[model samples]
Target: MNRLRTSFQQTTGQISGHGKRNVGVLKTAFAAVADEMASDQYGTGAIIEPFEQKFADVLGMDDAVFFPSGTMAQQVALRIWSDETDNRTVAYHPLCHLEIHEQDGLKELHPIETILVGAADRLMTLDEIKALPDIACLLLELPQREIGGVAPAFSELETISRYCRERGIRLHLDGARLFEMLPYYEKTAAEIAGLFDSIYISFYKGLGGIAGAILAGPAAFCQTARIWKRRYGGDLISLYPYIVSADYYYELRKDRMGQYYEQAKQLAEQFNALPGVHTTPEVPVSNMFHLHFDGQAADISPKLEQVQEETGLGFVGYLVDKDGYCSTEISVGDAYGELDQQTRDAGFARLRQAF
Candidate 1:
């Protein structure tokens, strides 16, 4: 409804971390499989099964099942852990997607109780985990998105993992941004996956896939997950659209995370240099970070639109209210690198003036 946002949205060659995730991705993603006679019918087919297996191997899990969404996948994971342990309580960050974004579906739709692990302002510590009441599972979200993609060190993670395993607490990873965080941890997907008992990865977030997630774990766990997917109405007639795109984009950008991580650090530095602006974490551990400005969104919107109009490049499309200052998130992707140096420099120059 705002004229400034509309103008920025219309700018071509605008900057962003990822390419436009539009219907065009679907058209191109399915092209490779067009000649095939078979499609995944109700989550079992030539396409979906192998796709699930590929991630299972990457995560070093015995098996995996694809669900229509990560919310459903996580709920199924915690529910299974609850039943086996005879404990209905689960713990995770207050900022966790299941806790904050899913609108209480975990507790309402599933037989699970949620115990927020730590304060919202920082990463959870082992001390917090040790003090929590008896719980079936502990959900860890690496590169904690709500706190600007901050992550625990590998050594710290190992200590927590050992404690949880010895105490029979199922450690589950909410690795929605798993691919984007690999470079920061200096570990392969399997190396980190080895730390947790179960994992849920999103194909749609950093991978830029259409919309699907994989819940991976032991063989018996995956079987129970498949049944849960049906019960949650996540088993669609044909999930080829999400599966094909997931495979296509994963292959396209999986190896580029190291590059993205490097670029994000550089990008965050440039934003920090801007007057009245600073980024959370100051240096990015992944491709994403938040930018907080010393003004209101009302004061920054028209200024951002002016920069886009002048340069035909977008520094950001969002201006959220921080009550006092303004805040926006920047996720560096291939698009930023694709722009010529002069064009990129010009965009930042104009953006600087606005701030």
Candidate 2:
């Protein structure tokens, strides 16, 4: 208890830099909302349209369309490409977001089939995809989120893009954390995404937007997506809140990845070094990683609660494994800036003592 308390006392400074300061940004945005509200064009207003345009311009795409969800936007884009090529199968890896997380929405909504290729926990390469003769499109995720946020090297991405171009396979990028990978790759967003036929970016992940996403591609592709957005019931009565939030955070998020990256590296290093503990994706390529406490299952909550009581540091949930291990995924977000090394060390020390 003494050691834990000491650690907590030493680390209070790092936790406040995450999301709490972002709250002040919201105050500034609300004033914009008040100014816009005086006019009657609240629903289907100019806010969202210009927001979309600014997004497209930043990405250097000729056109872009906003959607209520990435799922909806991606499905729409896939369906359009499938219908255009008269092919309905999407060639992707087993770990692709559409295959793993969409709950069969692809089969039901798009009437499309997914042709799995390559390893289940890594980037899909060109040879794994070359054997497919009837795929309408290929989906690539930079920093594959489920698999330790790892991505192919820049040259590899280029080779894959070239292979797709030679084979007439339309390429789509699931760029939800594209911003997070930008700093590491030393490539502009446009340069990174230019070779693909379409790109989908999530506004909520790194940007801290309310809830929104965008699909960017050629003008014709975007025009088709707009029709699908209407068909999918995404033409909401009000999108200003989401749009405004995205606009505000988009710029802020671009320069903020370094801090999260640093934290993730430090956290991963600290946890992996502890006795009886382990980490998957040992070095996270992005802002997230998984941590496992080998013998800290039942005692996790109490240890975290003890830390919070002493230092006001919030801890993530812990899930127990069959081997008496407790694991939790640590994602470095805006909220992470508040935590200092002392706070984390204190929490871990308590966890160790509890076990």
Candidate 3:
């Protein structure tokens, strides 16, 4: 973390995939919808309801409720399921967001217990989940973000969903990046969501919205979630900023996910050719993957930073030392699609010199 390794905000380059979001995003996001001039909503009006219903329909759920954050919605959803099953214990992979990133919010705030199964290096198997005893629910993240955004085999998901249903163990999808995998699975969002009892989606990651999440499920489940939203103080007076940006980006980028996935495969080909560099999964299941460089973070990080400075193309914003490799996550987005191959190749050539 030296000064030479500047922050993502300080990177002046044309970002390749993921980059620091600036006001320019909002400028472009609202331009087409400007004539709408939506009024303020005290957690009730504006385009919120319509937006929620649109996603609900897309997911083939009975209803949906928007929340200020995925962390809030997830905990509330798990808690509601926990109450219904009469067991506070839930199961998921060890590196799940609630397990490592939430600072104990799910356990401390919602008072839910978690059973962690499977190795962190890969997706959890059905056998691992079946071994667990008497859990209230299982929260599965499609394309586990911690492991190069790789998804389990669709067959595994189908069998696990059936297993859970027959045994009365509810399945909840932490599908923040769910839409990213549709191209890989060759299945519709509603079809995949059909396997889960409840599901959550984010507006910020793949959709590029300001920040918000939706929890969708049966009508009564969503009704209870709305009650939890108010109880958790998640009912903000005006969510129109997030709502507007969400819908705008959804219209702009939803169909483009297939395009992004194609570019990711092409980009991974280039990465695998670089000296000491390669991508995990070899082929991406979504618009994202892990970039692994053969060295410790301390040695290779500055090279990535230097490449960013010289090429004006942000290929790697940060790196971490993991399993004898220097690693960073790369997610394909609008910027990569906008670049010419020669420019991208020139950036990689500079990266070669630095490496």
Candidate 4:
């Protein structure tokens, strides 16, 4: 808590955060915001419009609309698409974050049923999707978060897209971690995104924005989404902080997504080789994955505390148990570049000793 508080302390020095490459760019971005603050507000702001434009361009979409949360953004998009198809249903994996983590938002808010594709714990393939009834839209999460960021192979995505197109099902991509996958898959963002009718990206995740999501699609589709946003209570008076951060982070941090993806793969390899640390999916698909250590969650905090005390390395987020093993996802940032092999071995060694 002290470190976090002091890290953001007001100062005029060369400020740096988890991603140092962004600092120089963020300074310039924020300077423009400083001049435009008073005149900016929610939907009708210079900063928000420009930021959304840049994001739409990056995704190669004709239009994009900002939402306060991906949960809201995705739900609204699915609802809109489903409604357009006479409220048929929304199809996705059983372990999709929307289905598992959103606490039944689809049922309560949209009341749309989902078709679980493939095994309950793996990426859905075209074969599995072919067995299901045609739905209004087929939702594909590039990196399925429920299975520790495992993604479908590029060919699989192409086959799935072709299948959905033949079935007349609109393809919607839950691209929350899409930014991270660009590098790992060795595919251009536009190339991967071209198959989807709509793609949702979170500003808060890879971009380091405070909070915001962008839904990109055809101009007509996004125009309809604007109405949905207003109906869903996402239209704010002015989301200055989120807009500023999104603009700043997008311009600077976009290039580092590839580096983070590689680091995630490397870290997964290292941790998976540990005696009792089993990485989710056995391998990682992006710059995120669940590291499962065969240790009690109760023992994690104190053990981690002692490790940090001795090694001078802090695990900031958490250590929880997913499948009876203490597991957590690691977000590789600028700090990863500073970690030498010796430092990494020492850190994991402490974890092993702790267990």
Candidate 5:
């Protein structure tokens, strides 16, 4: 089983997430740094600070600080809010990364209490947020990735933001895929980011970098976040490699997300027409969506492998099985962008034939 998994990853054309690269490709990516004058030292240097400034400018924030991971960036941002408001209570959706994926890091490390808003399997509503007591901060994940890249309506989002502002509560955006959401919202990145007090954007997700995250906010807030980064041991002696990769890939891919979003909707429509296949949200709001297959993973894996062997196209990276139903996320990225319309249609046709 493990043997096939390794072979599959190496040979697959377009599965999920960003494009997969070999070690050589990655080394070449880092080699571009050789053209630079120098590297960062102890969180101070040319490459890192300029990248941070550029990130902040792109997001329409006063300043930005780089973190090795979104986990540290989010926790530290929320901690600052908690301290400022003198409230230990922070509210977020139950399925938020902070709630489920972080292993209680915010609660344990910051020793702050959490209040879960919204229903267990849906986006948090303004009413749900208003129903809560005063909170130090409210963490909102744009596109809510865990649940089929779903997001709230723009007016509703504005109402929530206004509510939080009036109540003196901080709004922090877990915008791991913010760029992907722009086309659907028809709003500029700055317009969407303007709603939040702090925003955490990822380098490795939609931007297609190696790994890194930038927390953008007020200059003083970023100054505080930098201190927290040092305290959290995220301030490395050098970050130019990740910064350069982020800078390059972001410029290359940022403008293409709207195209991806359009492609995603067309793909979702195609998938929904297939038998035994259901797409959440019916249409994609971002560059990704969830496909629920009416079969067991054990039954589907072999068929998918067979299809991959016969045809050059491949899909399905991570799939969750609940009894007989299997669900997987599909994201459109550089690999998908490389395909022509006819080829993409043929690939989808092959995928349908597999099931």
Candidate 6:
């Protein structure tokens, strides 16, 4: 543990979903936001409203509302659909964050029951949705994080969207990584948002904001969500800090997503050439993929740590035990921009030796 700790601390240019920011960097960021203007008073200031409008414009939706967390945004969005349709059941992938991470908050707080659709470890195909009974809402995560960032084909997505609309079912996009997937789809944010009734995007995920989320949808839907936000204790007195930082980072990182996607494919190519290692999904459909090492975490983690110590290259973060094999998600971000082909190859060679 100490060896790994030393290596992680010593590594200068580590690759990760988001690069590490020093305390000074964070202080400067917040200071920059603070310098802008007066603060909001209970979510009702000049800054907050304009920020929401700006986000709505960017997403090409009728309105947008900011939330302190994605959990609140998603719950409010689904609750609105549930109330409007008078149906309490919502459907999503079996491994969706709402199903597995939120401790059944929807069922506990709202009159919502979730039906897990599709296979446990793959993107929900259109066939699976067609088999389900009537649902108030269908939550579709654009880049399914649990299954190695796998996304359905554009044609399949169109089919599902059409089916949902025909049945008068509301389609909600849990698009935490939607911006990251745009290059693959070759579509504008407006075009993608047009396919769904509501969309929730995480500012902290790919945009690298400090902490915030946006829920974009119809004007009426957003108005109701604001009411629910107050009920859920998400109506912060002042969101200027989060709003300004989110605005700053969103502009800074949004365009670089395509480069990260290309880097992910390149990195996947290098890793696939190694022995006893494989990537889920074969070819990456986004800027992320799961790295499977044909060994146990307990056996391989220390070896990886030793390699890091010797090479000053830290790769895998936490290894998850999948049956007897270990797996970890590799998310390409700004960190990939710092890695050259030669450096990446050497890092892969070290990983091979470690395993």
lDDT of candidates 1 onward, in order = 0.86, 0.73, 0.84, 0.74, 0.83, 0.84
- Please provide the root mean square deviation of candidate 4 (C-alpha atoms, Å): 4.7
lDDT by residue (155-232, candidate 6, tens digit) is 777888899999999999999999989989998788888889999998878777788899999999999999999898
lDDT order of candidates, best first? 1, 3, 6, 5, 4, 2
Badly placed stretches (over 4 Å) of model 1 are: none
* Residue-wise C-alpha lDDT for candidate 1, range 62-103, written one tens digit per residue: 999998899999999999999999998999999989888988
Q: What is the C-alpha RMSD of each candidate to the true structure, in Å?
A: 1.3, 4.7, 2.0, 4.7, 1.9, 1.8
TM-score of 1: 0.97
User: In lDDT terms, which candidate is top?
Assistant: 1
Clashing pairs in 1: 17-333
lDDT of 2 by residue, 13-53 (tens): 33322444356656655664666352213223577667777
Candidate No. with top TM-score: 1
Q: lDDT per residue, candidate 5, 53-78, as tens digits?
A: 88888889999998889999999999
Per-residue alpha-carbon lDDT of candidate 4 for residues 264-317, written as tens digits (9 for 90 to 100): 778778667767677786766667777677766665556656666666554424
C-alpha lDDT of candidate 3 relative to the true structure = 0.84
**Predicted candidate 3 versus true structure: per-residue lDDT over 1-355, tens digit per residue:** 4633564436545434644678877777777776757754656776888888898999999999988899999899889989998998999989999999989899899778898889999888778988989988899998899989988888889999999999999999999999889999999999999999999999888777778898999999999998889888988777877878888888878898898899888888888988798899788988899989998977887777777776667777777887788888888888786667787788878877875
Where model 3 places Cα greater than 4 Å from the true spot, the runs are 1-19, 32-40
- TM-score per prediction, in order, is 0.97, 0.85, 0.94, 0.86, 0.94, 0.95
lDDT of 5: 0.83
